[PDB]
């Protein structure tokens, strides 16, 4: 009998020069640079450039990159039209999936996968995607589209188009950090989906559209939305002693755990000792707790993670501190995963291009366990 590799656990599918994920040391390198260091002193734009070019940009390279980014943000007429054909009650990920699908379809160079074509498509997609997210949230709130501002950077513009008012320096900074942390992460389900689609020699947009579908699930990127929904189930409140928070948090967890349910925002396929991005994202969460003056959040937050460690020895992942952060920022919970897409577009496309450069069709085998050979009547 062959060895069955359920979920491809522990299976090395390929080599990659984009990032290194180390469980033992809770470390993550983006083309050699530790993510904590990039988050501490780089803009998402620099990190986006880094992931694609394998090097941090010099002043002139960054200027050109930033100029292209800020001039490719406007939401295409047909893409907006497609979003308006979708109900304001459908899932934001399905809207993102549709938007990117239309973007790829009407793209002048949809069929060209040359390094130059893919980079241009990748950068243009990264630039325009935030307009999809911002408009999707505003339309649900009965509001209208807000045009991009060339005087605002990626993060400041993202917040601007969504809320129609410039965010505080601390807020755009905490948002920038989350984009960098979510940017890239080896062969996760969505990135691998993108590589499988690419392995067939299908285009970049086809790959991203499939990756978006994968990122949607609660076991993947959908965990950030799930984390916040969970905090909404349990009462948020204010004034309640830490007893309320911890007793109720553990109580919600106790009830979920006894029902054999998984608690989202905890655990990881690779990280067995803690997420490399958690300390950084938690620091951003703390900055936001302080900024919006809402220490109440921590009650439920601390209580649930303490209870998980105690009951299952499972530490939180990036989605745990990220959900509450976007909540404080004013985003609707359903929009949390689309925010992950916005950032992960960088990692997805870098892998798509890497896959194209050293391709081999990805097509595994299955072991049959169905009905034995029968003759058709």
CB 254 within 8 A of CB 246: no
Tokens of 9: 């656990």
Q: Which of residues 162-191 bind its own copies (CB under 8 A)?
A: 186-190
Task: Tell me the closest approach of the beta carbon of residue 153 to its own copies, in angstroms.
Answer: 18
With contacts defined by CB under 8 A, how many residues of the chain interact with its own copies? 102
Question: Which of the listed partners (ligand COA, its own copies, none) does 210 bind, with a CB threshold of 5 to 8 Å by partner kind?
Answer: its own copies
Residue 106 binds its own copies, judged by CB under 8 A? yes
Q: Return the number of the residue (222 or 321) whose C-beta is nearest its own copies.
A: 222
The response to whether 344 counts as a known ligand-binding position is yes
User: Angle at Cα 322 formed by Cα 317 and Cα 324, nearest 5°?
Assistant: 120
**Residue whose C-alpha is closest to residue 226's, from 94, 91, 98, 39:** 91
The response to whether 248 counts as a known ligand-binding position is no
Output DSSP code: residue 167: P
CB 252 within 8 A of CB 307: no
Residue 214 binds its own copies, judged by CB under 8 A? yes
Question: Which of the listed partners (its own copies, ligand COA, none) does 258 bind, with a CB threshold of 5 to 8 Å by partner kind?
Answer: none
Q: Return the number of the residue (140 or 269) whose C-beta is nearest its own copies.
A: 269
Q: Which of residues 83-102 bind its own copies (CB under 8 A)?
A: 85-87, 90-91, 93-95, 97-98, 101-102
Residue 318 binds its own copies, judged by CB under 8 A? no
Tokens of 61: 């390279």
Residue 81 binds its own copies, judged by CB under 8 A? yes
Strand order in the sheet with 27-30: 19-22, 27-30, 33-34
Interface ranges with ligand COA (CB under 6 A): 9, 219, 223, 262-269, 312, 314, 317, 319, 361
Q: Select the residue whose beta carbon is closest to ligand COA and give its number.
A: 267
Q: Return the number of the residue (104 or 316) whose C-beta is nearest its own copies.
A: 104
Q: Find all residues with CB under 8 Å of 248, minimum gap 6, and list them.
A: 234, 235, 300, 303
The response to whether 228 counts as a known ligand-binding position is no
* 34 DSSP β-pair partners: 29
The response to whether 277 counts as a known ligand-binding position is yes
Q: Find all residues with CB under 8 Å of 165, minimum gap 6, and list them.
A: none
Q: Find all residues with CB under 8 Å of 366, minimum gap 6, and list them.
A: none
Q: Return the number of the residue (55 or 309) whose C-beta is nearest ligand COA.
A: 309
Burial of residue 14 (number of CB atoms within 10 Å: 0-12, 13-18, 19+):
middle
Residue 6 binds its own copies, judged by CB under 8 A? yes
- Residues annotated as catalytic (active site), given as ranges: 220, 268, 319
Task: Tell me the closest approach of the beta carbon of residue 192 to its own copies, in angstroms.
Answer: 6
Q: What is the 3-state secondary structure (H, E, C) of 137-173?
A: HHHHCCCCCCCCCCCCCHHHHHHHHHHCCCCCHHHHH
Q: Return the number of the residue (211 or 343) whose C-beta is nearest its own copies.
A: 211
Residue span 261-290 as binding mask against its own copies, x where in contact by CB under 8 A, dash where not = --------xx--------------------
Distance CA 136, CA 80 (A): 9
Among 179, 215, 289, 352, binds its own copies (CB under 8 A): 215
Q: Return the number of the residue (261 or 290) whose C-beta is nearest ligand COA.
A: 261
Distance CA 270, CA 209 (A): 24
Binding-site positions for CoA:
262-266
């Amino acid at each position: 009998e062959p060895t069955i590799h359920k979920g491809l656990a522990g299976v090395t599918a390929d080599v990659t020069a984009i990032s290194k994920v180390n469980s033992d040391t809770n470390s993550l390198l983006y083309r050699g640079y530790p993510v904590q260091e990039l988050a501490a002193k780089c803009s998402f734009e620099q990190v986006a450039y880094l992931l694609w070019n394998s090097e941090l940009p010099n002043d002139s390279e960054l200027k050109a990159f930033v100029n292209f980014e800020r001039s490719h943000r406007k939401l295409d007429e047909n893409v907006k039209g497609a979003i308006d054909l979708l109900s304001t009650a459908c899932h934001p990920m399905d809207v993102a999936r549709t938007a990117v699908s239309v973007l790829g379809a009407n793209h002048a160079r949809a069929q060209d996968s040359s390094p130059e074509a893919n980079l241009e498509k990748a950068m243009s997609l990264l630039a325009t995607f935030p307009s999809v997210v911002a408009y999707d949230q505003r339309r649900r709130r009965g509001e209208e589209l807000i045009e991009p501002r060339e005087d605002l950077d990626y993060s400041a513009n993202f917040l601007w188009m969504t809320f129609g008012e410039e965010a505080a320096p601390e807020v755009v900074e905490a948002f920038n950090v989350s984009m960098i942390l979510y940017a890239e992460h080896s062969f996760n389900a969505s990135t691998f989906t993108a590589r499988v689609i690419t392995s067939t020699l299908a285009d970049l947009h086809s790959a991203v559209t499939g990756a978006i579908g994968a990122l949607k699930g609660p076991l993947h990127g959908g965990a950030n939305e799930a984390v916040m929904h969970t905090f909404e189930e349990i009462g948020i409140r204010k004034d309640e002693s830490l007893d309320e928070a911890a007793t109720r948090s553990k109580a919600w967890m106790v009830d979920a755990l006894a029902q054999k349910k998984k608690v989202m925002g905890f655990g990881h396929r690779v990280y067995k000792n803690g997420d490399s991005r958690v300390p950084t994202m938690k620091s951003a969460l703390d900055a936001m707790i302080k900024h919006y003056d809402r220490p109440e959040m921590l009650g439920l937050y601390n209580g649930l993670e303490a209870a998980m460690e105690e009951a299952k020895q499972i530490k939180p992942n990036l989605d745990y501190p990220a959900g509450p952060t976007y909540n404080l920022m004013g985003f609707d919970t359903e929009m949390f995963t689309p925010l992950f897409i916005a950032a992960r577009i960088t990692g997805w496309t870098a892998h798509i291009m890497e896959q194209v450069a050293d391709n081999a069709l990805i097509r595994p085998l299955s072991e049959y366990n169905g009905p034995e050979q029968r003759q058709v009547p």
